Design a protein around this ligand. Sequence first.
Ligand code: NI
Ligand code: NI
Ligand code: NI
Ligand code: NI
Lengths: 298, 298, 298, 298
Amino acid sequence: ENFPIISLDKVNGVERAATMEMIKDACENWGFFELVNHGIPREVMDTVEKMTKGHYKKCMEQRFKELVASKALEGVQAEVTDMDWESTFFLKHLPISNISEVPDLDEEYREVMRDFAKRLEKLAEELLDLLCENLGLEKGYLKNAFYGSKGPNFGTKVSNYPPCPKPDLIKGLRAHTDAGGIILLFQDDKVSGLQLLKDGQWIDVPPMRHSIVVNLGDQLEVITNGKYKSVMHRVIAQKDGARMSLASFYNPGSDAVIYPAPALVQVYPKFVFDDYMKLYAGLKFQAKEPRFEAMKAM
Amino acid sequence: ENFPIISLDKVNGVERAATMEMIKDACENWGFFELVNHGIPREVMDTVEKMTKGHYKKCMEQRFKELVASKALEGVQAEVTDMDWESTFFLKHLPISNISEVPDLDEEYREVMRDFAKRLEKLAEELLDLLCENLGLEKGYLKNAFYGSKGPNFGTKVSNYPPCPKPDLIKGLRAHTDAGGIILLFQDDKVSGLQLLKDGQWIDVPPMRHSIVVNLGDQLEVITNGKYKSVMHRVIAQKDGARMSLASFYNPGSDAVIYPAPALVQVYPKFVFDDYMKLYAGLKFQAKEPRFEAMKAM
Amino acid sequence: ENFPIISLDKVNGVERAATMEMIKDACENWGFFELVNHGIPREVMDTVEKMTKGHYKKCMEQRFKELVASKALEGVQAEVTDMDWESTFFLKHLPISNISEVPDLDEEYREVMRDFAKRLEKLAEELLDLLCENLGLEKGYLKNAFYGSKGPNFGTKVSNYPPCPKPDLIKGLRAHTDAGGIILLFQDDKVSGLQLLKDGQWIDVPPMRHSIVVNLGDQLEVITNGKYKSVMHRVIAQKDGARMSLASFYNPGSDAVIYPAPALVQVYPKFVFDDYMKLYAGLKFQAKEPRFEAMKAM
Amino acid sequence: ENFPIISLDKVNGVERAATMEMIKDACENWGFFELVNHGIPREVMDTVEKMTKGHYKKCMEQRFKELVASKALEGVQAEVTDMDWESTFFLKHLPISNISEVPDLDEEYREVMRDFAKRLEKLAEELLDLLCENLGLEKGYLKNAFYGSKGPNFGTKVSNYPPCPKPDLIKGLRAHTDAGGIILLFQDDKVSGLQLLKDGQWIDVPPMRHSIVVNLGDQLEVITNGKYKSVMHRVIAQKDGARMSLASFYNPGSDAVIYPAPALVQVYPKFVFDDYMKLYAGLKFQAKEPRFEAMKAM
Ligand code: NI
Ligand code: NI
Ligand code: NI
Ligand code: NI
């Protein structure tokens, strides 16, 4: 019954019970919701957008000069059509902020991303408390569970990309659930180009200006014992939609022990988060002894 | 007075003198013309288009599987937005046909490119004879001059690409003339996305279905003693234009001695074609003695 | 009690029972043996060696020209010390021979590798029959089990490399067992630079001229139900040892169902070989449902 | 009459005239000399050596983990023999110190390279004054000429590498002169593996412990009007020689106008240093008009 667009300002007013029930429905039946009025000004978001696209334009002009020169060595003229327009870089925020160390950024850009990261962290931890309330758990339970020793892993994937040549090329393309905790996507434009899978069929995430698309990953499903499931999805670059994405991942800390909350109890396993990501990466079957056991299980 | 669109069938009929004068004007004042009715059926061109896009789709599906796997090693989920959609490969035709050796092609594809290359070679050599006539030179003079010992260098750059994220990113992007002989561009769609520079300003090459965009390179300017100049240009991927290009270069042979025709005589130099491409590639100033002389000249 | 050096000519003579018992001991307690007098002339091996090093020298001279040119673009002089001396390429033999398709080889080289591959296949299948006899299995049981539908996967990794800068850099470097069936290593020089792990400690494979170092992989351990174990090992480039390796892998076919032989019966699993290599590669935990089950097992 | 080994401490003592004449001979007839007792303690050099090799060992262990993982995706086991042992990175000192920005270094390492760079700068500027005296020029003339506006380009190439597989592979390998000003090489071991060309034949640079191999580049030849020539040379990794190099280049500033000193006057050209490096890189013949003129000259 339509995608959950949720006005987050309504959670400190008279329409709170409706808004929290809307979040509850989203968490249980969609695994995805779109936030508006979320305590991050348009001032801040447009500043992030303007400067990211500025940095992107520098990288593309630099890339073309290098392409023209490298192609010229082969006795070949580089065209603009030979461009790899894709550019992606990651920024660590927690536990240690890696914005200082990332190459080729303005200082004014670095400051705004430190500010932007601080604001999202509060939003993420606010949302986790709203989930804690809907689930019937104490405030900061999910923040606590995500902490481990050092603290939770938090970071932003900043990517700029062209549109797809034709949509039919993305026909038999593989989808996924996010392995992490909670994910917050900020984009330019209205159109995200993001689809999710509900009851066998693709639904587009509706376009909204100045919105944050939130979704739940595999860890929240383990902690909620299957109640809040991580849903299948895929992001596709639309012809006249978004061409810039800022996916911010708030996952548990490396050494954090993840398990279903005792109260919320067919049964999801107990494990350390780094082991889950080591299974995901495929490092846990480099020795032969693991492999024989896994083949015995299958 | 509008871009030269030239119906090549008219060169064996009553409207020949007009058509040859149209080619003459194009050669002298545009360095570029667009051919229609050129002795290559729509049957053949659409067969080249269909199968190239088929091969492109295989490469992109393969590239995504590898991207998903390689990104997964870093504990990162690959999105479709992370795709490098650019794919380019070259096919040698003359003097030795390298279609047999190029990896990852269908046999049905290889055959059609051998056929397509044979047809373009005849078209290129036909066009060169039409230029020979307009200039006042014997039939096959330009074919002869291009030959050297082994024969002329002929090959096709086959590229598939996405559209540019925004046209403003291609604002301060560098243009060029082609270093070679004569260049024949076949694309999908009507819109080439190709602009050329005439009297300080960009003119778009008009869209035409089933056309071959011909243009003259630096060598024909040397051979014509500045009469047929190689013009500045740049190709840009339009949002809903062409996303496939087949640039076929008919250049002189490596050891071919290029110089202005004695009859057509401020004075263009004499040189071997490989030396020109070695200057272009920047191999001719690796030793210090060349560099001191070049700095003495400047 | 010393590494098993096995003269294979002795298997059709009076010293056969001793030689087969030597193979039995090697298969059970070493997982590794070194063959001499193996039905491949020194004529053939030296022809393989001479031409591989010839092809390697072409690739290195070509690589330096490209390195000098690519570095020159950055205003930097390339030194010989900037060389990546490592060069590796794979040749498929069975089920479909890919020697025809591999780029940048002489025809005389291609022919000898087709011959060399044919000879090794016979040697591998001979050795498998000798193992079949020692185990108490019918002739061609292991060849049969490896077959599947199309046939067994057979191919050669051809690599050329420099020596290690210092041996201490290879101190905390990870070792492994081979995932495949049976592996046959041919090298230049006497010194392989190959060590294997027996009872907690590294033993060098002894140097022998014109030898083939054979070893058993994980699949033969599954088929023998732990009787012939695949042993840990690592190959290291010695300062004045081998600088060329030809590791030939005779593994089961993709769709071959591997399981312990009924007669030889704590219990090794049943599985298709492609699933084992998909676990090895880490493709079998890209979806979330597999991961939750694996974490439930641990 | 043997390579010039020069004790630099002797320039403030009774054997000064002999030592300066030794430098004069080296500058005129060798283009190369080896310094000992040069005002940089063994304390400092061994500290640079120890920590660089430490950083190198971290990079190689990291590279192997990535190699094992990336190869595992293809169903292939990575061996130690598959290692690219080559590792090179550049450090800018003047005009702006880029040691702060270079990734993956210890802070203790960064400090020592800032100290090491400060000491070499003084040595380089000392040597330039000694050349100024031998030539008959005022103190700091070469420092002045190198300055331009911002200051001289100064930086260190820090590289670690394996030995060459066989010396015959480096048979037909191309040599060069250095395009810059003055170059100072510090290595581990005694054996540099460095040869230079004098009267048609290769001479090895003699091995010396704790030495700095100095040589003159193309710019000093222009400034001295051919009197101090930049000599041909090549560095080769010896089997049991040096496996670490620190080539420090003290070149003129980008905008510095280089020309023969009026007093020292067949005639070397006047030019800005960035134009010389743009000719070297091959950027100055991307447009057609330059190319026609260059072919007219030839
Ligand atoms: Ni996702
Ligand atoms: Ni062009
Ligand atoms: Ni192995
Ligand atoms: Ni040098």
